[model samples]
Target: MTEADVNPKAYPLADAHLTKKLLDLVQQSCNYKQLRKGANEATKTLNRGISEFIVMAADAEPLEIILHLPLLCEDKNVPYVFVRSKQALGRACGVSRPVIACSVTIKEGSQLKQQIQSIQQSIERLLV
Candidate 1:
C-alpha cells in the first residue's frame, strides 16, 4: 500500500474511515458550491478568511507546492488533513484531473454545516 510513501509533514493524516467521510463531504461541498479547488483557490480562501478546513494529497510530487498551506491553515486556525490520493481527491471534487489540494469554505446556514463540522472535529482530534 506504500503507506511509507506519505510525507512526514502530512500531520494529522486522515484514517481510512475519516478519509471516506472527508471525501464524501468534499463531494457534497461541490454540490453546495462551498468548495474551492486547487492550491491557488485554497490559498485565496485562507487569505480571505473563509476557509473551514484544507485537504491535501499526500503523494504530491515534491510536496512543496502545497506545503505552505498547513502553516497558513494553522495561522488561520483552520483544520487540515491529508488523504493518500490526488486522483481520489479529484474525483471527489468532480474534476477529471488530479487535485493536489482544496479548501472547504465556510458557508452560513449551509446544508453541509454539520457534516463539515463533524469532519473538522475529527481532524482537530488528530492534532491533540
Candidate 2:
C-alpha cells in the first residue's frame, strides 16, 4: 500500500520485526480459535469483553470503515494497532482473502498468555 493510505488515527503500529511477531501471534491465535477476523467480528469480540487486543490493516480501503475501532478499543481498555498489509494479515489468519481487521481474544490459562502479554507490552510502548 502507498504511504498516503495510512490513517493518522491509526496508532501503535508495529514495525518490521514486531510485525512478524504480531502476525505470528495472529496465526497461532487462529489455530487456537482465539482470533476473530473482519471488523464486525472484531467489534463483537470487544463488545463481548473477550478481546485481548485488536489488529487492523493500515491499507484498508476508505480506512474510516474501521476507524471507529481504536476508540472502541480504548473504551474497552484493550490495545489496538495497525499493520501495513491486509494481505499479510489475511495470510496470518489462514484465509485467502485480505482481512482489514481482526481481534485476538483471551482464554484463561491459555498457552498464548505469555506471548499475548509480551506483544501487548510492545504495543503499549508504541503509544508512549
Candidate 3:
C-alpha cells in the first residue's frame, strides 16, 4: 500500500511484506467466521468492541467512505492498515466483489488469537 502515489491520507499503509501476512490472516479468519467484510460491518464490530483489527483498501475510488475508520480504530484502541488493493482483500475474503474494508473480530478459545495478536503488533509499528 506504500505506493507513494497513493492517497496521502491513508496512513500506516502496509508495505508488501506485511500485506501478505495480513491477507493470509484474512483468509484464515473467514474459515472461522471471525471476519467481517465491508465498511459498515467493520464499523459495527468496532462499536461492539469485538474488532481485533481492521484492513482497508487504499485504492478505494472515494477513500472517504472508509476514512472514518482510522479515528474510530484509534478510539477503540485497535490496529488498522490500508492494503494496496481491494481486489486482493476481496479474494482473501473469498468473495466475488471487491471489499473496501474488513474487520477481524474477536473469538476466544481459537487458534487465530495468537496470530492475530502478532499481526497487530506488527501493524502498530507502522505508525511509528
Task: Identify the leading candidate in terms of lDDT.
Answer: 3
State the displacement of the C-alpha of residue 61, model 2, in Å, after optimal TM-score superposition: 3.3
RMSD vs true structure, all candidates? 4.3, 4.5, 4.2
Per residue, candidate 1 scores C-alpha lDDT tens digits across 1-128 of 57566656666676787788778888887788656778765767877877777777777644665766556445448667778777788888778888878877778887677777776777777756
In model 1, what are the clashing residue pairs, if there are any? none
> Following a full C-alpha superposition, what root-mean-square deviation does model 3 have from the true structure?
4.2
> Can you write out model 2's per-residue Cα lDDT over 1-128, one digit (the tens) per residue?
57666656555566788788778888888777655778766667866777677787776754665765556435447667788777888888777899878878878887788778877777777755
Query: What value does the lDDT take at residue 4 in candidate 1?
Result: 66
- Give the runs in model 3 whose Cα sits over 4 Å from its true position: 1-9, 70-76
Give stretches of model 2 more than 4 Å off: 1-10, 72-76
**Candidate 1 off by > 4 Å:** 1-9, 72-76
- Cα lDDT tens digits, model 3, 1-128, are 45566555667676787788778988988788656778766668877868767777767645675766556445448667888777888888778889878878868877778777777778767745
Pairs in clash, predicted candidate 3: none
TM-score of each predicted structure versus truth: 0.80, 0.80, 0.81
Ranking by lDDT: 3, 2, 1
